[model samples]
Target: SIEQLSINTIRTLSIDAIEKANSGHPGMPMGAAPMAYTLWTQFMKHNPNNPTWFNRDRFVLSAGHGSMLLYSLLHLSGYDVTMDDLKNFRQWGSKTPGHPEYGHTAGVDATTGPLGQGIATAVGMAMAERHLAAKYNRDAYNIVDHYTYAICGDGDLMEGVSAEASSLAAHLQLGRLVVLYDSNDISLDGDLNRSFSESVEDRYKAYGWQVIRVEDGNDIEAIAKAIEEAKADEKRPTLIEVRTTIGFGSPNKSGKSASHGSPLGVEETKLTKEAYAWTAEQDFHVAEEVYENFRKTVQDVGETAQAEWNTMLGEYAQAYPELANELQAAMNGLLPEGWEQNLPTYELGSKAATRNSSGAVINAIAESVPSFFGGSADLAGSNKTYMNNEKDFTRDDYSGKNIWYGVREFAMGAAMNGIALHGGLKTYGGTFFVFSDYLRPAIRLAALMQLPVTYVFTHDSIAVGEDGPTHEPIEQLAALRAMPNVSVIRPADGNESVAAWRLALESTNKPTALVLTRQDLPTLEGAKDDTYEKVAKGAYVVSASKKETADVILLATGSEVSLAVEAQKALAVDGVDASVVSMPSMDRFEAQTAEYKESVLPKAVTKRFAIEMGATFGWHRYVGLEGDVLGIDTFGASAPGEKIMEEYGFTVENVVRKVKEML
Candidate 1:
């Protein structure tokens, strides 16, 4: 049968890929082949020709260790991935990696591998689908209709992140999210009962998801019927548990842990191939019938669907030109032209917190950039991230611009990535600076994928005073800076905040975090209207010392920039000349030319004082070993902001003393 052949083809491709790469988890691909084939051929609405087709159902391989299963499906179903790509699995520069990457692979929707992240992100995508559909899909034009499907394993359900996300997804009633649980009753260590003993179906039911079960995942009819029933449930997300063996057809290793990671040996491989009646001798070989069957299942279905959608879209264009244009631009994954033109430019001497200034910038650009979607982690009021004059985005109010992600910070961060990956939205999330620990995994994934998502972190330092040590962020700066492809910007004042927003918007391949202050700052006259333009350079001299090679350099960032300036003046009174360099972004500074770096901090000036209201870990890289750093090494106390500043030695007098000591 075509179904059996396709399933066997998936298994063989996985075996061949693992054998060639000499690394990868092969068991899930081997065991879950039938379920995967059943889902793709029977239910998914993807168009391989136009991978970015709007309203196409999204499929996330939550068991990303079995990436070859997805790759084989994409290749056989006539996606951009080819047989050679499968052969090059896990190799450098190949589409088929050890884990499935979303944008890297043509047909893949969300990057999975972090156990439950794919399931969580799939929920977010499903939410986005429903929200879009509710807001835009009129009676005549059902433009925003789609579903998000995720195939999760035992390990995925065990992860806490998925638990949190699934709870929220259930509460929101995301009916379009259909999660297929590969309930094989085994894990990497041993049988799942060794660690996981909770009733999963009951747990999901308590969480409010519509639950279904399949006696055998290899039973194609049963799997298809469950998927149909899942689609029928339009009130809550569905969780279908499909039970199967660990390594389905492998003679000796079918139900054992040995098949989990290692490739089946030559004898087992031959037996497995013969069990499926696959006569192809070579590894990665595909019967012509198998390829034709998949092509007809995927490509033909896609072409027909696309033609119908095109016709509907033509009518939609005539009836609702403006919305149609917006949808078209969104479908093309292109931001509106001149969207950044409205990014607010604050005047020097404006008295405002960077967070508030960031809010103003967001409001300024909100109308022009439809894709600029974001929300706070129930800190909208404190973080100043709410879209002014716009309604709140909730299950009931999908037309609203701002999202209310409740208190789920970690899930919100991952969801923002899903929105960004879904295309049509430059998503961002906001919370207190100290709360970054809650979302570090999502942030790390954003950095790894180089996604253009903004992380608006307010209450950046000890200035988050009365909230005490638990609320203040002393180590976040160093920790965030440590991540590759992540840009950390701590703006000095209102104008600098504007600059930071500009940089964040223009950044396409890096995740940008704006660490904004909770306290108000008087914008300095040293900055011009175009001061923000210099922010792209990372470091710029706010006030030059006589425009000459100074005896010492005073480097500062965020709220400490003014302190550095004050310290420079105090040092000059003692005839100790110094320069102040406002280093807003260290990552950008490192990218500058050697001459530019030297121009900011002269090589001749060895005496340097780097000051910031955060941990002093990364300062030595810029200040050198001999230079001094005036930064917090410990937590802050529950005191007034002024008292905290004094206690932390963030005042001009203390900074001047430190600079002199370094000199």
Candidate 2:
């Protein structure tokens, strides 16, 4: 009777919340109430009083359209979400949004409105759990153990990103990830069988996941039993298929698409409430007994678990003080003190790629900052993103600092976001610059959530050569710069790479992308210690003519900076004084004051030529109508690096010629 009352209360809360808001998907909360009730009551571990508890199990509602379901559960479970919060659902500044957003809601683990992102992010969280457990946990202390659970619908599974993430999750043997498949066989348009009738359980099994099925999701006991079995299996991740009717209790709309997004009318709602024996007259009503039962099961259980863990953790700290200190820092989600102080600084005149410089900086920072964890999309060797001294992260070796993310670019990016959201590590991932297209969705989510994820994209331009147009990145720099709240840093040399890392580490909200060159670049004398300070302003003159008024300005980025410097000398011979400005980050530079902007690009001179071996789309903004841009507007042909540069007009002669033409 308590089970029936509690489940029905969840249903009614969802129905009333959607009806009251006059917006939101209602059918999921109605049909999946029993499944949710069983999971929360039997499996999820958390403290409602302290949602930031480090060891708490993470829950992601991947089927974000069913957001009302999560809101109802959070409210009933005493997770700081109140009736007023539910009443204000979808309203501005309210805790309850259409989708459950991590950090915005007390119990929501990840921001998941983009279908498969929640599940993909959950995979990243699971990876974090394993990595942390390996790194911090001793023989006597298993402090970081936690599970990541995601409830997904057909849409989440249908998406390509989830498939990529799930494949990696399986290969990694992430036994702590449990995916509850809400197989109601209904999509918003119509029945799923009409378009998607593959064997889902078999598909998961093929991906190396332990699969279980429930004939009736409304049977809470069966669902609980499956979850218990899932938790017991420590060898592989589990996918529990829960079959149920859409809008189960709704007399008219049950098992129909009408219940998916629309509200059941008042007459049907009354009949549904009567069917559940609910006597309460008001909307969003919860029976006193049902509320108490949920509070005891959800809130009280989590508190007890956390209290017990606190005792164990106190003992762990007493036994190992140093480890305890590290754990405390990790739990607080703070970087270790002086983490950025160790970033490697390159010598002037040294020739190295920014990607290689970033790798050195990563290793240097990793020595002091244990939280700096990341890997590449099977391109670690080329991307130079592996931890020099740390072990490789694998199923058997969780202590490994570097992750081996295979070739799943989209999954790797989304998972990096998850790792960042989980609050322990400063996560990064890498791939060829062109492949960013595959990971753009996750990157966008990182921007939306303001997660501190660093994306290291190497082979930044058509200068990569020999790889041809398919592999080269022409539009990437402009594409990345176009993204709001994302820092796009294309470092000129090794020393500027240090500044890039400093910015990435200090930034708490926005995601940072370090676009590093594949070819080696001469580390400018101007890129030395004090000279690198100009990088903070985003753009600065690396070299300028002695003439108070220069005849022309040569602007460049990445490997092209050296070419600009060469061109400046050539132009000076003709008495056409030129200044070479290294514009590393357009976003950072744009944020500077007007005075700073004018100081970098003096108003007295307008003859500017922006040079870079990429699409010239964004050049017009920096180079006014009076100036010109020397950049590639087409794809690159297969050739050696030097030949490609000449063919693309990236040589000093071409730059000087372009400068004179502009002048």
Candidate 3:
């Protein structure tokens, strides 16, 4: 009776909130309530009082349009979300946003609503749980042990991002990940049969997942049993397809697409409440018995479990102090002391690609920071993201530091967000900068959530050669720079590359993009001495003019910085004094104090020339109206990198000519 009451309460709260807000997807919450209620009351392990508890089983509402389902559960389970919060749903400045947001609301794990990302993110959380358990758990201490659960809809399954993530999840054999499919057969536009007709269970089976079918979604016993069966296997992830009706209790709208996105009308709302045999007729009314049931199951039970974990952790600290300290520091987002002390540096004029330098820096930092974990999207060798000392992270060994993400760049990006959100690891993913487009949506979510995930995007420009236009990235740097809360660092050489990694690791609240080159870059003057400080400030004078006041300024980024330095040397011979400034990160440079920005690109020096092997989109802000920019607006041709560089007029002769013309 309590179970029935609780489920009906979830449905009513969702319907009432959406009715009050006059904006929400009501059918999803009404349909998915039973399964969600079963998950929260029967299985999910979370301390509502301390929502950030490390080992708590993560619950992701992948079908984020059903946000009221989660919000109702949170409220009933005694999370920070209050009754008033539920009443103010979808309103301005409310804790209950239309979509579930991770940090914005307590007890919310991953931000969802972009369809497919939440499930993909749950895969990452599962990986993190398994990895940490493998690395830290001893005979008596299963400190990192927990499951990851998600409830997705037809829309989530139809998204390509979910397909990529699901394929990878099965390959990794993540036993602790369970996804509940709310097979309502309806979408916002119309019936799902109109657009999607694939056999989801068969598709999952082909991907190596264990699929279970619950003929009725409203059966709490069946849902609980499916969850248990899913957890029974220690090797394969499970998908429980539960057949639910859209807006189940509504007489006329039930099982129809009409109820998908719109609120149930006031007349239908009363009818639905009557259908539930709901005791109270008042809106937003929750039965005392239902509240007691949730408090007993979630809050009281979770606190007891957490207390036991706390005692175990204290004992774990006594027995293995070093490991405990490391784990604690990692969960707290604290980097180990002297983690950057061993980062590599380059002597002036030394030649090495920034990607190569990035690899070396990764190895060096991996030695000190055990939390540094990642891999490439099948571009390990080319992206130069492989850690030499680490083993591959696979189904057999989750303890390994390196992850082989195949060619699934989008899933890789979303998974990195999950691992970062799990709060015990610093993760990165690598791919060609041109291919960054594949994962751009995930990157946007990372920026929106303010997760400190790093992205090693290599082969940053036209220098990607022979592979031609398809492989070259001309607009990526500018595109990523335009995003908020993302630190896009395009390093010039080995020294600045080291600084990029340093800044990425040091970040606590924003995502970082390390845009690196495939071609070798000559280390510029002053790069070895103050590259770290200068790169942090974003731009610096790598080579100042010999004269007290320069006739012109040469501005550049990535490999072009070296060309700028070379042009300064050539300009001196032509009696044209020039200063070279290496601007690695436009966003970081914009954050610098006015005096510091003035010191780098002086307002007094209007005769400035900017050069880069990418789009000229964001260059005008730095160069001003008086200056000119040299960039490749057209697609690159198929030629050797050197030939293309020369053909693109990236030579010192062209730089001098451009600056001379500018003056």
Candidate 4:
């Protein structure tokens, strides 16, 4: 009786919260409450006391519009969510926001709102568990074992990102991942059959997953049994398709789209509560017996799971102290002592493509930071991101550092989010710079979640050449720089590339994009370890004035920094001394103090000229209104790399001409 009552409590809680807010989706919680309750109370191994237990199962609500459903579950399961918090749902600054936010809420595992992101992110978490389990789990100590579960809807399955991620998860054989499909025939627009007519079971089956259909969604026993069957399959992921109604108990709006996103009217709410035999007059009512029963589960069952994990970790520490320490530190996302010792260094005047420089730095970091590992989106050879000797991260072996993401750029970004948020690996993924558009959504979420995932984007500019105008990244740099909380670093030379990587690895609060060039850049003759050390500062005086009082200051980044160096030399012959500054990251540079910024680009020398091979947007901030920026404001034409660059005014001659014009 109490089991059914508890399930009804979740439904009423969600509906009441939605009614109070008068602006939320109420149908999902009403419809999907039974399976959600079964999973949380019976099978989920999560501990509300320690919501971040490393070995605990992860739960994601892919249909994040139904955030109240998750909130009700967390509140009932003894998580930090309280009755007052749920009452204030959708209010400004409330814990129960419109969608689940990972860092903002107490029990949210992944911040989810964009339909398919939650499911895709869960796939990565499953992959992380598998990888860590294989790497550390011993014969008797299965320390890293865990499962990832997610509840999605017809809307979630229809999203293309879910398909890509599910395909990737299936191909990788992440068997511990299970998705419960809330197969409600109704959607906000109408019956989902109108738009999505294909059999979802057959679709997932084709993707190589175990597809199980439960005709009766409200059957708690059936839901639990499907989860058990899913857990039994250690070779492929499973999709439990549970057929359910859109609004299960509403008197008038039961099967209508009206109940999908809006609150049931006061009369309808009363009739629905009466139907559930919930005779309480109050809007947010919970029987005291429900609280007593739920708290007991939290105190005994949740605590015991965490206690067992703690005991296991304690004994493992006693047996293997070094591996234990490394695992702990890795989980904390901390860098090892003297980790920078393995970072590669380059002398001045050594020509190397920034992409190759980045590859060298990645390999060096891999030696020091075992948590540092990832691969490219099927362009490893061109991106120069494949680890020299690391094995592929495949279904057969999860110990490898290199992840072959195939050509799925969007899926790779979403998975990287999961791997980073799941907390054991500092993951990265790569592709051509122009293709960054495909991965933008996940990248935005990374910035929002403040995950320190690195994105390697090579072929930084028009120099991509005969690959055609489509391949050239003219505006991608500016587009990325416009986004908040992301640091876009385009290295000028091998030394700055190393510094860019260091900054990225050390960042704990934001994503970093390494916009590197395919063409080799000549290392500056004057670039010394001492001067280049300021690369992490985001901007540095690469070429100082001959006389302390310089005639002008030139701002440049990436390959064009070397051009600025030559332009400075040309101006010097004309009896005009100029200083060149390598501004690798505007975001990082802007973070510096006014004193530091003024020292680098002193207001005294107002004559400024900025240069880069990408679109000229955003350069105006550095080069005041009076100053000039030499950049391609339009697209590039297809031609030989050298000819294209020269035609586009990305040459020493153009830099010299721009400086003269600015002066």
For lDDT, the strongest prediction is: 3
Candidate 3 Cα deviation (angstroms), residue 407 = 0.9
Q: Which residue pairs overlap in candidate 1's backbone?
A: none
lDDT of 2 at 396: 85
Candidate 4 residues lying further than 4 Å off, grouped into runs, are 297-299
lDDT of each: 0.85, 0.87, 0.90, 0.88
- Per-residue CA lDDT of candidate 3, range 69-173, in tens? 999999999999999999999999999999999899999999998999988999998888888888888979889989999999998988888999999999999
lDDT of 1 by residue, 1-663 (tens): 778878888988888888888887778988788988988997888899999887799888888888888898899999999888998999999988889887798988877888888887887787678667765678678877888989999999998789988998887788889999989888888888999899999999999999899998789999999999998888889999999898778888888878888878768878888777778877788888988998888889988988888888889889989988887776565777777677766565568889898888888768787766788999999999988877877656667678878788888888877776776667788999999999899898888877788999999999988988999899999999998989999998888888888788777787899999999987866655567667777998888897478978989998988888888888889988888888889999999999998888878888888999889998988789889898999888899988998988999999888877877
lDDT by residue for model 4 (233-297), tens: 98999999998987788879888787899888778888889888987888888888787667675
The TM-score, computed over Cα atoms with residue i paired to residue i, of candidate 2 is 0.96
The window of 10 residues in a row where model 4 has the poorest summed lDDT is 524-533
Q: Can you rank all candidates by lDDT, best first?
A: 3, 4, 2, 1
Residues 111-215 of candidate 2 have per-residue lDDT tens digits of: 888888889999999999999888788866778889999999888899988998999999999999999989998987898888898888898999999999999
- Cα lDDT of model 4 overall? 0.88
Candidate 2 runs further than 4 Å off: 340-342
Q: Which residue pairs overlap in candidate 2's backbone?
A: none
All candidates: TM-score: 0.96, 0.96, 0.98, 0.98
lDDT of 3 at 483: 89
